[PDB]
Symmetry: D2
Subunit: 430 residues, 4 copies
């Protein structure tokens, strides 16, 4: 046990720091004049282009597979620094890394080689998307007896036909609504999309993931793929996770990521449990910019009295608590990622640790922005301070990458319920 | 001890709902299409005009002073209700009420007759503002040995000369930046305003209130009253509370609301204690809107599953916690306004109850919207639900109207520390 | 609406305070010297005797039925003052009250007259118990599908035969293990006590309540009613709430309280809803003792510094939090028992209000004792202060009178899920 | 960054579980029959004897000093295992670790060799005690202008003369009230103890540590050293920390630990910072006992339902919240201790980290035990579960070892207020 950072870990951080200040700081002058969600997301392209030009997309892909990813701790340190300054574009890198996951994670070197190609290249503006989420929601997608997913696939010849709607998956229609360079569309296999799911089949056995690229979309009727809309979001106002209708959408059997069933759900599960751990780095960075603006203010403004605000017990108390949450949070994300990475542990041990991390860090970052604001007082509520932005931004986190109430709390409840559950396995082994 | 409502109480409510539904829901369509705080405030003018026509401004003024205000519970009921639908305009009404309070509460019938006449007339869109807050903060305005207010006043012959800046005062510039129809400006008396407050005088002894009209400003040089700015706020985006610089600004002695010193500080303290209790009705309206939107969703939505979202223990739990916060908060606000109205009670007993009320109800309203958003899940985060508006608006309450950390917890703590403190005196008597 | 107390509410307070000061403060000299739960219960008899002689057992039966109960607001006020000083004996009174409740609430003049007679006489030390609780739990006692209560009854000729175990019912074995003077035993009906509950009959349809007296027990065989043990409890170390076995226990049909089924369940439910609301007065008393002990200490102790510790903002903050929780809880309790007494309101509005009361008051009393200890510091942890006793006493409340996690939040949740639920009905009617 | 345990960190754990299971489990039979705090402590003497025989006292001293302590993380893992089973004796081993710390931390090799001999011995029952706390309190001992420590020392010839009272220091009177084998007595230097601390001198410059053995006490008159009492504690009922008076108590110059003043104060600070960090492991163990007992219950108990109660979202949510707290706590304890051992790091940085750890782990473990009791329900309140023991044990943690409100938060506030404060020095370097 050791918490020291190697020189490569410190360079990643200097690097992510330098990119956030020199490039990210300028994003806002471009997007803030834009009209609606997409205009703002599009005003973001030059900065994501830089992100690739700085090698940050290549760093989403492990070295065995062509990329420059050194570890998940490196990745945790980079996201925290990025989010600490500007979640525009930074959010696009992460959506893209999530998009690449189920490939990154498969049995097929040829799929890996085929699909990872534009991201590991160092040029353009390539975008991935794990399209799981729907208009009718997903907390119960694996429930025996229930509607299951409403994006369905049937096999017609040597292709697959997709029928169904998706909502929220970031990046999913690219910069232009012609689609994203790669997108892993998660489906339920239904021969007849007019049939309810069979209440007697395990929903997990019917999962299929089907890659879909700008090519697939194009080799298809102009209306087999339409963008019905784009949510106007409370914060993260430069992201795109549109409403997408699939109508008789043809995709080649070669684009099938793995056997449908338990193996396809495994990859979606594993992808999502990784992003669950990494997302705490996003919360950390946001709440960290809250606390740091609050700290600098409290150490330099006396608010009409004789001493700096930090000298009031109640002010220091709010700051102490933010600090505590940030520190315990970080420790937990690093603990989580390192546990994911450890080949000796069973999956369910790694999954329990990831759910904890997602739940704790996202919940606690909310508390941390709000205490920061409360300590600054009325000033924190005017837009010449970061706080109105941070507050909207920070509320995404318990909600997204699978909300705490619906998904992550249940996934951890299921694991704890198991006969052979070991609460301390990630620490004390066995 | 009795909680049943009277006929006038039930009608006050039916009337406020009818006005919020038929008039206030139409406001968004007008203010949304505007680019800056001030435009969005100006766009609200017709709704304020209807409110006067509906009696609602006249009902900010006590019956014996010519108004129609029936009781502070009547006021409470109406503000919850207005605030459960649309804070735009609603917040103008309550800011006019605060602005009218130091006149309401003074003991001079000729000043009352004169200055309250516009606001009981049934006509126009007259605005009032209590101009207290300052760019440097006010948590410490009564600190002995501190700098004190930065708006000072001095007597020159037969008039008063205001110098310095105000920030945040709702409505203070008016519809058009030529002033509110009535402003009570709170100033610290200083002969040489470039010399520090004397460390040796109780700051409360130097407080003056000066009434400043559209006329007083019209009778001064153009650069003697300058709006330097209008904060862009997170929520309540249709309010106005500019940054105003008074430079050698002449007020007539007949505009002095009373003799400078402890009586003047006392009128201001009593004004902010009353609004400290009432602001809980605002908090409860905004959180009720959250809890109700969530509740209706939880009961009409299975969120891809077999059963309505409310049949899940963790979902019910959040809704239960919100309900309880709403319930306890309303009880407290009614308890507190009823306390303020009790003649048999010492002011310290009334002060303490009003501070409790503001702290609790405002803190817990935030918890309430956030818990509602959580139970609704990802959908609560897009702007075709009310939540992203509700969240930004609720964060105002702990911060504004004297912030809890700096102002109200300290006012309460001064009373608790007094030798003669009777914790339960509002309940069980002296 | 009104919070002013009448002269008899003031008197009731005066009288409960004088009783607690002059009588209840002496109990501890007697019981502390004792070896087990029961001897501590037994050492408390002279104090219950004084309770009876001060008319306090009679004040648990309403005037229409021959007792002196003035109103549930009166009751609340007495409970607060008893528990503010001494829960021993105080607990026995409220347990007697609960055990009388189903006779009180049954619409049957001959039963009322026969069974309440000892409790209105102002003589002896008669005890009553409501025997619902069981060794295997009771949160799921109305679950269709489930095993249901395991105290069953069957009618065998002109009489009823009880077989099963009860645990936790206060006072149930009387002073001497020969039985409470009146016990209401809730059973599930099964003609064959070895058959599992029929999973297609709604459990509420099978509830019976049988009245047992020391005479019913004496006309049974010795081994038909055995006390199997007495829990040694964290706090309230002077209550008896035994483990009881019923083996072939013979009860006269005419000791049957009402027709088995929904009417019988409905009686148990009403009794428990009323104690739900009144138990908040207990939680308040205990929490209030803690707060008032910390307050007086904060106001007189400098802790080796130069000011009373109440002048430290982190000290003030905790006591402010305690005051807020006490104040809200009391308002809530009075709202609840007032709601319960309203004939115009339907059952579910009342039950929901009561559940809300039990949940909030009992959770938040814990926090209020723990924060009071943190305020005082080390010294709170030693038995020359009250805090050790209160700590253990306050933690009963979330758990007993139907726990919040499994009983009260489920009852409240079931109400909130009905299509015809009106959240604000107890406040603004329908 | 690495979280994997070394084979000796694993053996430390095994060794500690073994000791606790085989030895500590037997203490309760012995101490439970004893009728006061000292009697209960005395009953423990055979278990501390066994702990010395297992080398646990020797493991409290670093290797270069003739001890067997391998690292602070080993120490943390050890104390977690002792406290997860039984704080009796365990509490004495850490109290002795603390009493030894001023001596271990001093820069003086022959004083080490002399005073540490009996603790690295492997033999007897030697006790140490850090005697700092006083009847009047210690949160403000360092306050310029305040009263200061009420235990004072003056130089007389070649001896020091102690006057005043200590309260709470653990083990301070020995097994028999003739004193601990080594007590470090913290005094304020004063030539006339009847005269107030000089308000113009920095309290930290007047600090002296005198080492007092059974010999030092033996060489004095009977009434120079006297135990005036022994607090009866809520929890930790077998530990001793008496009320001690010193009256003209004479200590030799060779027993002064170091030069009075800032060097001496720094030795006290350093020792209490180390315990502040390590005490989290005590808190983790108590809260873990609670979590684990409830988790077991939850997966074996249906509570008359048809499913194990962990199957209920509300129950699981409780256990999830506990687990998060214990996980985050442990990470933070390991971070804190590792940070203290970092020679490359500045003291402020180590200090802040240790303060954070104490505040979090000891606050959050109270919540953890209370949540666990809520999940188990009525049953947790009876003394045949371990919860009544845990509940009183846990509430010591936020209070003892420097309370969180008075001491630990204030220390952290002063570091955060420093101009050259680096929030992340411990994670990211300077
Ligand atoms: C910026 C942003 C980016 C996003 N990026 C992506 C992306 O790359 N890929 C993608 O797939 N999605 C993405 N989303 C969606 C995101 O992951 C959501 O978390 C996902 O929609 C699941 O949402 P939900 O947890 O609210 O569950 P929902 O199904 O919408 O359920 C909502 C609520 O119902 C309740 N509930 C439902 N079922 C249960 C139950 N069984 N038990 C208890 N409570 C229950 C819970 O309160 C829950 O909060 C994005 C969203 C945003 C805002
Ligand atoms: C919608 C809206 C309407 C408004 N309407 C009005 C109005 O009608 N009239 C008017 O005058 N103003 C108005 N304002 C301002 C509002 O009343 C503010 O609450 C007021 O500016 C005081 O803010 P503050 O409590 O943050 O104090 P500040 O003095 O600005 O200090 C801010 C922070 O410093 C810390 N702090 C400072 N001093 C202390 C201390 N001694 N102890 C502990 N902590 C301390 C606290 O954390 C505090 O929150 C309005 C603002 C808004 C958004
Ligand atoms: C099991 C056990 C073991 C112990 N072992 C030892 C030991 O080995 N050595 C030893 O010396 N002591 C020991 N004690 C004492 C222990 O370390 C206490 O923490 C110590 O007495 C200080 O307590 P306190 O923090 O409550 O400070 P106090 O000075 O007693 O202050 C009490 C309260 O006053 C308020 N307060 C006072 N000043 C301020 C301020 N300036 N700002 C804000 N709030 C303030 C705070 O709420 C604080 O909680 C032990 C006690 C126990 C129960
Ligand atoms: C001082 C004292 C006096 C008492 N007086 C009486 C009395 O007069 N009469 C009487 O009948 N009893 C009495 N009892 C018992 C008391 O009312 C208990 O509340 C009752 O035993 C039920 O306990 P419980 O809520 O924990 O339910 P249990 O059935 O014992 O359940 C325990 C825990 O399991 C979990 N759980 C079980 N089912 C569910 C579910 N469906 N959903 C979510 N979680 C669930 C919850 O976390 C719950 O807290 C007394 C107890 C004490 C300590």
């Amino acid at each position: 046990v050791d918490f020291k950072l190697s020189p490569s870990q410190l360079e990643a951080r200097r690097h992510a720091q330098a990119f956030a200040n020199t490039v990210l700081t300028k994003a806002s002058a471009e997007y803030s004049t834009q009209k609606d969600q997409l205009s703002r997301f599009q005003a973001t392209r030059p900065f994501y282009r830089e992100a690739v030009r700085h090698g940050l997309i290549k760093a989403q892909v492990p070295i065995p597979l062509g990329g420059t990813m050194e570890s998940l701790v490196h990745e945790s340190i980079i996201l925290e620094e990025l989010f600490a300054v500007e979640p525009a574009t930074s959010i696009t890198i992460v959506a893209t890394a999530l998009g690449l996951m189920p490939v990154i994670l498969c049995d097929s070197p040829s799929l890996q080689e085929k699909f990872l190609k534009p991201f590991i290249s160092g040029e353009g503006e390539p975008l991935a998307s794990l399209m799981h989420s729907e208009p009718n929601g997903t907390a119960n997608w694996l429930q025996k007896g229930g509607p299951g997913l409403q994006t369905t696939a049937r096999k017609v010849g040597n292709e697959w036909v997709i029928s169904g709607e998706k909502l929220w998956p970031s990046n999913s229609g690219g910069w232009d609504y012609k689609g994203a360079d790669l997108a892993c569309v998660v489906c339920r296999v239904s021969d007849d999309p007019s049939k309810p799911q069979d209440p007697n089949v395990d929903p997990a056995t019917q999962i299929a993931v089907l890659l879909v690229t700008r090519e697939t979309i194009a080799n298809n009727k102009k209306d087999a793929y339409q963008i019905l809309g784009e949510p106007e979001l409370a914060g993260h106002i430069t992201t795109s996770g549109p409403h997408t209708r699939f109508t008789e959408f043809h995709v080649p059997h070669e684009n099938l990521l793995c056997t449908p069933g338990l193996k396809a759900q495994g990859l979606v599960e594993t992808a999502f449990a990784m992003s669950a751990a990494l997302v705490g780095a996003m919360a950390i960075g946001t709440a960290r910019a809250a606390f740091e603006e609050a700290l600098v203010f409290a150490k330099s403004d006396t608010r009409g009295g004789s001493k700096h605000i930090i000298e009031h017990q109640s002010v220091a108390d709010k700051l102490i608590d933010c600090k505590i949450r940030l520190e315990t949070s970080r420790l937990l994300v690093w603990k989580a990622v390192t546990t994911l990475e450890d080949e000796a542990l069973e999956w369910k041990v790694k999954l329990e640790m990831a759910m904890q991390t997602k739940i704790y860090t996202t919940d606690v970052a909310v508390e941390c922005v709000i205490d920061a604001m409360k300590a600054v007082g009325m000033k924190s509520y005017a837009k010449d301070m970061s706080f109105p932005r941070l507050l909207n931004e920070v509320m995404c986190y318990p909600l997204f990458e699978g909300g705490n109430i619906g998904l992550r709390r249940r996934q951890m409840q299921r694991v704890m319920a198991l006969e052979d559950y070991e609460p301390w396995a990630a620490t004390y082994g066995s």
